[PDB]
Ligand binder design. Structure first.
Ligand SMILES: *[C@@H]1O[C@H](CO)[C@@H](O)[C@H](O)[C@H]1NC(C)=O
Ligand SMILES: *[C@@H]1O[C@H](CO)[C@@H](O)[C@H](O)[C@H]1NC(C)=O
Ligand SMILES: *[C@@H]1O[C@H](CO)[C@@H](O)[C@H](O)[C@H]1NC(C)=O
Ligand SMILES: *[C@@H]1O[C@H](CO)[C@@H](O)[C@H](O)[C@H]1NC(C)=O
Ligand SMILES: *[C@@H]1O[C@H](CO)[C@@H](O)[C@H](O)[C@H]1NC(C)=O
Ligand SMILES: *[C@@H]1O[C@H](CO)[C@@H](O)[C@H](O)[C@H]1NC(C)=O
Ligand SMILES: *[B]([O])([O])[C][C][C]([N])C([O])=O
Ligand SMILES: [Cl-]
Ligand SMILES: [Cl-]
Ligand code: NA
Lengths: 343, 189
């Protein structure tokens, strides 16, 4: 067993050191948002394969005083020079500068911090600047990712520079330092988010993306905005409300899965015998299949009209119509679930 | 992708999911800044690229300048009728995010598994296309049998299915769990 219960506050990150950094921010009087940002800056180091200031994020935020939830959309956008037919192979869309969308991460941290921050901006970076310089043992997750991508890393000197030892990827437990990122984090701490989007880092960002074959420009960075969503998606389950992001994220899919399944009134009894458990898991998979059939009509709601799609996906009555089509005895062919590529 | 969950002493909460997309993103690192750039453009559909046998590219998710690509991310906060947070949850793992988040919720809310069990319990995934159910290596094999006798074809995940970080309110306070699949642990006070 490996349980962790806290009387006052908690941070669950995917690396212990980053959870601790978030926790320390809370103990120092930070808001949940301050702690989240401090932890995220650390995850961008310890799990650098996963996320960081070159990417984008969404935050779902709940204020217990106002009893209101909000969402911050800071996902990457396609650059101004992008177009529908820009890629002709998977390799083109996956590797190199042309695969890069405009990073949203730091503008997301900034907007969240402006709205909900208590600690100084620079304080959020300090522990990560130290960590990046001192280094840390490569953890389980990063080690497995390094091994998985060993060929590409080892043949790219700029990645080898940080992720290898003796020309081979780092193994679990070996020390990783991130000295250039430490310096970038320090600049961000001192100069703010503007350093990234319209400041001292911007020209170099553009140079790096373009040198690798990309099309991101300074104007793209200058024009990037994180977006506050005051009315996130919600669904009612029993006496609770679940807040989650709508399109372009998958809240509508999650909502539909749960609304399909809620009509089965699952409980501990649902898993108490193999007969019950087997039927329960079959029903779960069928709910997944129905929900994913509807997902193909989703896209960025600024560009695609998803209004009716999302209304259905979040409708309890629609979900009941789908649950009625789940056969207890069998799954069905793909067409049964009515995936649609057009409305 | 990474998911983090936070509850502060005043009861406010954040569920945050962040990503550079594939492992190491675009594989473009700046030699000057150290920044590792995303390959989020890969999350768009492209008319010229078939990703999966028999699956058409999705026109709703084509690239346009200024557009954001569709995501499987779903950072969630569950709040009780009394205004107190009940659960903060989300996941990493591409298209398995949404199903894994659902499972963590089902496991805690309905099956009554504590938060660590809700995170550690074996998962399964089906996204319709492709037409297979993926199960984790340690799933109850009575579940595999129940699926196969109902005509699902199953395959075992080569590694694992998703990564979930969660916090649940209990009588004892805030119970937290990070997923052993990736190696995290929570912290608190
Ligand atoms: C894909 O082909 C289209 C049409 O010729 C072209 O506009 C685009 O530049 C191509 N993309 C790449 C990366 O070769
Ligand atoms: C929560 O809402 C209260 C009441 O409006 C406000 O005073 C406080 O700043 C909010 N907390 C955060 C972290 O934004
Ligand atoms: C900052 O933005 C202005 C326009 O908003 C532009 O003239 C200037 O070149 C930008 N500087 C950088 C470093 O992007
Ligand atoms: C759920 O969704 C909509 C927001 O558009 C609104 O009618 C309702 O107030 C929301 N419920 C809660 C509890 O926030
Ligand atoms: C919404 O659901 C109804 C069935 O309840 C269906 O008739 C309608 O076509 C659906 N709308 C969309 C946009 O798919
Ligand atoms: C998908 O799997 C189901 C379940 O065995 C089967 O009935 C169907 O023929 C498969 N193929 C398609 C195209 O749905
Ligand atoms: B993450 O590495 O698991 C990728 C998430 C991405 N496919 C998205 O935004 O859904
Ligand atoms: Cl670095
Ligand atoms: Cl994660
Ligand atoms: Na735990």
């Amino acid at each position: 067993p490996d349980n962790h219960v806290y009387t006052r506050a908690a941070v669950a990150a995917d690396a212990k050191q980053c959870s601790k950094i978030g926790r320390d921010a809370l103990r120092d009087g930070g808001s949940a948002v301050d702690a989240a940002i401090a932890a995220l800056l650390c995850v961008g180091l310890m799990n650098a394969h996963s996320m960081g200031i070159g990417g984008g994020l969404f935050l779902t935020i709940y204020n217990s005083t106002t009893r209101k939830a909000e969402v911050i959309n800071a996902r990457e956008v396609a650059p101004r020079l992008a177009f529908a037919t820009m890629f002709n192979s998977s390799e083109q869309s996956q590797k190199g500068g042309l695969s890069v969308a405009v990073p949203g991460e730091i503008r997301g941290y900034e907007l969240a911090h402006q709205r909900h921050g208590r600690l100084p901006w620079a304080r959020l970076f300090q522990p990560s600047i130290q960590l990046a310089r001192q280094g840390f043992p490569v953890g389980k997750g990063l080690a497995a990712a390094l091994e998985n991508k060993r060929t590409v890393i080892e043949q790219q000197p700029v990645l080898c520079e940080v992720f290898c030892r003796d020309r081979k990827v780092l193994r679990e437990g070996e020390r990783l330092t991130l000295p250039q990122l430490a310096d970038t984090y320090e600049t961000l701490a001192i100069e703010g988010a503007q350093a990234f989007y319209n400041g001292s880092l911007t020209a170099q960002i553009v140079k790096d993306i373009q040198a690798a074959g990309g099309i991101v420009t300074a104007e793209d960075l200058n024009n990037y905005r994180a977006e506050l969503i005051e009315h996130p998606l919600n669904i009612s389950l029993g006496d609770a409300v679940l807040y989650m992001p709508s399109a372009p994220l998958s809240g509508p899919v999650l909502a539909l899965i749960l609304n399909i399944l809620k009509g089965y009134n699952f409980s501990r009894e649902s898993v108490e015998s193999p007969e019950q458990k087997g039927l329960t898991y079959h029903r779960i998979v069928e709910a997944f299949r129905f929900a994913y059939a509807k997902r193909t009509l989703l896209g960025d709601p600024k560009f695609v009209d998803v209004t009716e799609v999302v209304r259905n996906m979040t409708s309890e009555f629609f979900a009941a119509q789908l649950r009625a089509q789940i056969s207890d005895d069998t799954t069905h062919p793909i067409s049964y679930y009515k995936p649609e590529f057009y409305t | 992708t990474a998911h983090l969950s936070v509850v502060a002493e005043d009861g406010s909460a954040v569920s945050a999911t962040s990503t550079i997309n594939l492992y190491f993103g675009s594989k473009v690192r700046s030699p000057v800044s150290g920044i590792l750039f995303n390959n989020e453009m890969d999350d768009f559909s492209s008319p010229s690229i078939t990703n999966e046998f028999g699956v058409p590219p999705s026109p709703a998710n084509f690239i346009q300048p200024g557009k954001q690509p569709l995501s499987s991310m779903c950072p969630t906060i569950m709040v009780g009728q009394d205004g107190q947070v009940r659960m903060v949850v989300g996941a990493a793992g591409g298209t398995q995010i949404t199903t894994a988040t659902a499972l963590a919720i089902i496991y805690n809310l309905w099956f009554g598994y504590d938060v660590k069990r809700a995170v550690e319990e074996p998962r399964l995934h089906n996204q319709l296309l492709p037409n297979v159910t993926t199960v984790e290596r340690n799933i109850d094999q009575a579940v595999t049998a129940a699926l196969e006798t109902r005509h699902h074809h199953t395959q075992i995940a080569s590694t694992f299915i998703a990564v979930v970080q969660a916090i649940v309110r209990t009588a004892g306070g805030w119970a937290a769990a990070s997923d052993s699949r990736k190696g995290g642990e929570p912290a608190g006070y």
